[PDB]
Structure 1
Amino acid sequence: MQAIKCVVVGDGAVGKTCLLISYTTNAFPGEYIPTVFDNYSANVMVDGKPVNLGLWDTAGQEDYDRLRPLSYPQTDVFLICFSLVSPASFENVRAKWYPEVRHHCPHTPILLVGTKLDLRDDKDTIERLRDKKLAPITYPQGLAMAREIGSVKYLECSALTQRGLKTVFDEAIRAVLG
């Protein structure tokens, strides 16, 4: 059976675990529990052929910076994630995640993933962002960042509503298998 190693990285609180668990199990986790490291597997049928999708759920916590790269050898595709309602997580795509990934895997494809799309129009979120001199990241801004890091695809999704969710993983798969 074909197999794909997909590794997921990004800041704390961005939604990496909810994204993986919502796609694989169709449930949105009820509790916010930061990850040390987890590995999930799921089967997917791709053009009639079964494919084994291996998912490497990494720690956004800086304190686990030395554990994180142990996931990287032989990776087939990276999802670098940031929250569409955290400018700081987005700035860290450039500042931290792209450089770290690319240092360990100089030619592995990267998909840029904007998470929490359900919150970009949440008036309270917008207001509290505005209070801190911030605004949600827009599609064009996301796409510009993706182009700058040489990503194969920029995708937006919500783990909570599953809008755009399957597409993230479908594209990740097509990025590796064609």
Structure 2
Amino acid sequence: DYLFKVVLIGDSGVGKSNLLSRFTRNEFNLESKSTIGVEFATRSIQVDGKTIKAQIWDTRAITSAYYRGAVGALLVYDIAKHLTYENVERWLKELRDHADSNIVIMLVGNKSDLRHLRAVPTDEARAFAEKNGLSFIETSALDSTNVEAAFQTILTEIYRIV
């Protein structure tokens, strides 16, 4: 029925491709063959009684195809690697240079399963989260936790731009 385009951006290693594989093929793997250039993937869900279809973009040098036609963008960091959270500031200057000024953003801490290796506290993140204009959640791509929730959340939030 409807068509919602969403992009995934973030540092290398944070888990974008497995987020995509969990969410779109319900599959995960520890061994990893690198994504060469670009992917999208698609799956349809329903929000508020309406059949929607979501388009996710998986990211070398950033051509501006990314950030084109995105109603929403999931900006993801690895909770267990502090630097990835640190660069969320640089990922938003990018996103303001190359993307729609009225776009939906979710901050995502991935790899929440690595409890004992955690380098970024949920509070520090959520503080920054509501201090700014981003929605916030923590996911784990390895185990099927909150991956579905994450998408369905951002997708519900989106259709509300009637």
* Residue type of the alignment partner of 2:143: T
Unaligned runs of 5+ in 2: none
In the alignment, what sits opposite 1:103? 97
Q: Which structure features the higher share of helix residues?
A: 1
In the alignment, what sits opposite 1:66? 62
1:17 has 2:27 as partner: no
Q: Scaled by the length of structure 2, what TM-score is found?
A: 0.90
Decide whether the 8 Å contact of 1:38 with 1:56 is kept in 2: yes
Aligned CA-pair RMSD: 1.5
Identity among equivalent pairs (%): 28
> Within 5 Å, which residues of 2 pair with 1:7-156?
7-35=7-35, 36-58=37-59, 64-67=60-63, 69-94=64-89, 96-105=90-99, 106-119=101-114, 121-122=115-116, 126=117, 136-151=119-134, 153-156=135-138
In the alignment, what sits opposite 1:61? none
1:170 has 2:155 as partner: no
**Counterpart Cα distance in 2 of 1:115 and 1:33:** 19
Unaligned runs of 5+ in 1: 59-63, 127-134
> What is the CA-CA distance between 1:109 and the residue it aligns to?
1.5
Decide whether the 8 Å contact of 2:6 with 2:72 is kept in 1: yes
* Residue type of the alignment partner of 1:46: V
**Counterpart Cα distance in 2 of 1:163 and 1:57:** 20
**Counterpart Cα distance in 2 of 1:102 and 1:146:** 17
Higher radius of gyration, 1 or 2: 1
Decide whether the 8 Å contact of 2:11 with 2:84 is kept in 1: yes
Aligned residues: 158
**Counterpart Cα distance in 2 of 1:175 and 1:31:** 34
Decide whether the 8 Å contact of 1:77 with 1:175 is kept in 2: no
Q: Scaled by the length of structure 1, what TM-score is found?
A: 0.82
